[PDB]
């Protein structure tokens, strides 16, 4: 019905990422202290969750995008978004 | 049908905040080690996400509240809740 | 019928937990740096959120599981999942 969001943040600036699932597409908005901008994340899904962790100053993000019973993990490790090994039996 | 929640926590006590979206209104329950109480956050939304970060011992919280395609950011930085600069274009 | 997910992570290995609400049941998938495996968490809910915090190297997790207007908190504190004191009046 309404759009569905997930958010994560890191450091003390801070950096924030907000994922929005909207009519079966998930997009990303980004804050690194200098204003909101559109991020590179673009994947299909009706539902989104996210978690992230720092290794020093390098951010690692995992976005979990679901359509039906299939959840697909997407990984940011500094070098673009790549499909992760996550599987489930839903 | 069911209500929809988002949660964040910080420190080692810990402090926890649970946001619940219910029939278009989001409310807040709080734990700081001494029992659950109703927090000050009260905003419209059908969907809620949240993230938080520490700057030293000072907590900062961002709650993302959505109704239809409009997501509104709310900010706690120690001194009450204020509308954030987040915009999307959904 | 789309599933709904929540995620948390900790440390820098990292450890990740992904909770999936699916036809009124919430299940758990786990990563601690080897493969993905099925976790012990199994509770009723149409909606799930989660937060976690470290006390030293010991993980503490709180999962908020909602069915209708009733949100139930589940606690991992290193030995097993136990019902938490969380209440709300939804
Ligand atoms: C630098 O690129 C921005 O930040 C990264 C951590 C990701 O969230 C990416 O999609 C976004 O466009
Ligand atoms: C190195 O493996 C990648 O990162 C791990 C933290 C997990 O998210 C895994 O599913 C992913 O493919
Ligand atoms: C001190 O006030 C309590 O904690 C703050 C961090 C906020 O979550 C606020 O809504 C709540 O009432
Ligand atoms: C300083 O700006 C405020 O805090 C930032 C971390 C962002 O959440 C932004 O939208 C908000 O207006
Ligand atoms: C050791 O047990 C595994 O990890 C714990 C932190 C919990 O996530 C539990 O459900 C899971 O099976
Ligand atoms: C010790 O109390 C347990 O842990 C706290 C951090 C809260 O989650 C509370 O609801 C729970 O019963």
């Amino acid at each position: 019905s309404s759009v569905q969001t997930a958010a994560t943040s890191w450091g003390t600036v801070p950096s924030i990422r907000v994922y929005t699932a909207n009519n079966g597409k998930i997009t990303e908005r980004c804050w690194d202290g200098k204003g909101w901008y559109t991020g590179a994340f673009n994947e299909p899904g009706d539902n989104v969750s996210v978690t992230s962790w720092l290794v020093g100053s390098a951010i690692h993000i995992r976005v979990y995008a679901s359509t039906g019973t299939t959840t697909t993990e997407w990984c940011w490790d500094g070098n673009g978004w790549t499909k992760g090994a996550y599987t489930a039996t839903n």
Side-chain angles (χ1 to χ4, degrees), chain A:
Chain A
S1 85
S2 274
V3 300
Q4 185 270 309
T5 68
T8 191
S9 62
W10 67 85
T12 61
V13 172
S15 281
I16 304 166
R17 299 292 180 272
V18 180
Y19 300 84
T20 301
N22 178 8
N23 192 37
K25 176 136 128 187
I26 305 159
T27 52
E28 181 186 45
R29 294 285 278 171
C30 309
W31 173 273
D32 303 305
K34 277 138 48 125
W36 288 93
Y37 66 93
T38 296
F41 186 95
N42 210 289
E43 301 299 338
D46 292 322
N47 179 258
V48 66
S49 67
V50 63
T51 186
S52 70
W53 66 93
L54 285 168
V55 176
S57 66
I59 193 62
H60 296 265
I61 314 177
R62 298 293 180 273
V63 175
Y64 298 92
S66 302
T67 300
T69 54
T70 296
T71 302
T72 300
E73 177 188 54
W74 294 101
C75 312
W76 177 272
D77 303 290
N79 299 305
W81 288 98
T82 59
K83 194 181 273 166
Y86 182 91
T87 61
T89 307
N90 293 326

